Amino acid sequence: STGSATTTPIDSLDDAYITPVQIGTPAQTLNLDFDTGSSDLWVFSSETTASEVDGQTIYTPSKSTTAKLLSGATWSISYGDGSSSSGDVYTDTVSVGGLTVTGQAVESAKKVSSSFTEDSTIDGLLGLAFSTLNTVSPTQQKTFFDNAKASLDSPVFTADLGYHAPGTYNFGFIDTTAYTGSITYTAVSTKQGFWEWTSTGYAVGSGTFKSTSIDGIADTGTTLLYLPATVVSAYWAQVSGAKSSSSVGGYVFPCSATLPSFTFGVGSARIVIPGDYIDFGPISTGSSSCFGGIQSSAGIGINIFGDVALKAAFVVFNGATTPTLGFASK
Ligand SMILES: NCC(=O)N[C@@H]1CCOc2ccccc21
Numbered sequence: 001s002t003g004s005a006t007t008t009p010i011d012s013l014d015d016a017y018i019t020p021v022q023i024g025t026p027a028q029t030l031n032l033d034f035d036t037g038s039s040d041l042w043v044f045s046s047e048t049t050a051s052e053v054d055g056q057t058i059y060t061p062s063k064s065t066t067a068k069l070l071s072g073a074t075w076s077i078s079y080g081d082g083s084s085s086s087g088d089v090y091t092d093t094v095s096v097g098g099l100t101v102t103g104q105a106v107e108s109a110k111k112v113s114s115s116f117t118e119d120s121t122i123d124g125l126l127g128l129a130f131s132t133l134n135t136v137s138p139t140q141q142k143t144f145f146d147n148a149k150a151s152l153d154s155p156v157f158t159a160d161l162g163y164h165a166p167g168t169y170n171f172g173f174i175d176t177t178a179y180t181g182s183i184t185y186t187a188v189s190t191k192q193g194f195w196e197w198t199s200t201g202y203a204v205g206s207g208t209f210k211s212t213s214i215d216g217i218a219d220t221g222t223t224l225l226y227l228p229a230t231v232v233s234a235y236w237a238q239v240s241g242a243k244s245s246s247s248v249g250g251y252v253f254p255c256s257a258t259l260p261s262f263t264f265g266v267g268s269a270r271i272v273i274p275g276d277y278i279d280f281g282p283i284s285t286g287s288s289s290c291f292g293g294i295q296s297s298a299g300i301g302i303n304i305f306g307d308v309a310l311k312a313a314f315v316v317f318n319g320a321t322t323p324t325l326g327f328a329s330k
């Protein structure tokens with residue numbers, strides 16, 4: 001089997017991407033944030049505290065003839081941005097882009113933190129990291145990808161995120177029309193439960209490539225690119241007026257600037273992030289100070305290849321017995 005679904009930016013900045021997902025019988029379609037940095041499929045629901053729902057579409061398990069309560073199971077998760085959610089668990093039929101999994105754990109939110117309530121465009125998350133990170137207790141549950149894997153034509157999914165435009169998540173096949181050149185594959189460590197890999201270095205604009213190992217995670221659930229302070233300082237030093245602002249929480253730059261590109265290494269290959277992808281717009285409405293798309297990972301404890309980096313590539317999440325990641329230009 002295969003599946004193919006369009007993913008769409010939630011706003012004009014590409015702060016996140018939503019993908020329609022069918023849950024239950026008859027189908028209830030929710031728009032979920034596909035997150036290769038976590039491993040829970042959770043949804044706003046008829047059980048979510050009413051004051052914490054503001055415009056989201058909800059899953060109602062009592063209206064699904066295939067829903068079953070997963071007796072005694074609870075879940076609770078916290079994300080890198082400080083947001084959180086928790087609740088109980090159903091199993092149900094879940095379909096993405098024509099690919100169907102029966103008996104998928106669908107985690108129903110009883111509580112969500114304010115940032116989730118405040119984002120009416122995201123109805124929940126669909127985790128695509130390794131199932132060892134799944135938070136369901138006392139019986140840990142599998143991700144949608146792990147459950148689908150044996151049925152897929154090939155044990156892979158691909159992320160092709162758009163810049164200010166829709167893109168595609170495919171399951172079970174590699175669309176050779178969606179990228180240019182060849183795909184370069186690189187080793188993955190699953191020891192922390194993430195799609196963790198080592199970039200071979202970087203360049204700023206037209207500058208020379210610096211060969212240096214950068215361990216980080218491929219994380220579609222993070223908006224920006226978080227790299228070591230040395231690397232980030234070298235980037236922003238090429239932008240007149242750019243500075244790290246403690247009050248704003250990161251590097252800002254004059255909105256009148258033209259940003260240089262940023263290149264990262266994948267083995268001997270190179271992925272170029274155009275300068276425009278690094279502009280996240282005014283820090284507040286009408287400000288002439290703009291927020292940067294490359295930020296320091298110091299005090300995260302890991303580097304994060306988030307959407308800013310991933311949307312410059314066609315990315316293969318290869319879930320073979322020994323997982324690997326593939327990157328191509330597009
Ligand atoms: N976008 C990815 C993300 O925020 N993941 C969070 C942050 C810290 O690590 C974990 C571990 C397990 C589950 C979720 C997370």
Ligand SMILES: NCC(=O)N[C@@H]1CCOc2ccccc21
Pocket residue numbers: 176177178179180181
């Ligand atoms: N991943 C697909 C791809 O890169 N195709 C290229 C684009 C340019 O045209 C040609 C002509 C012959 C062979 C390959 C290609």
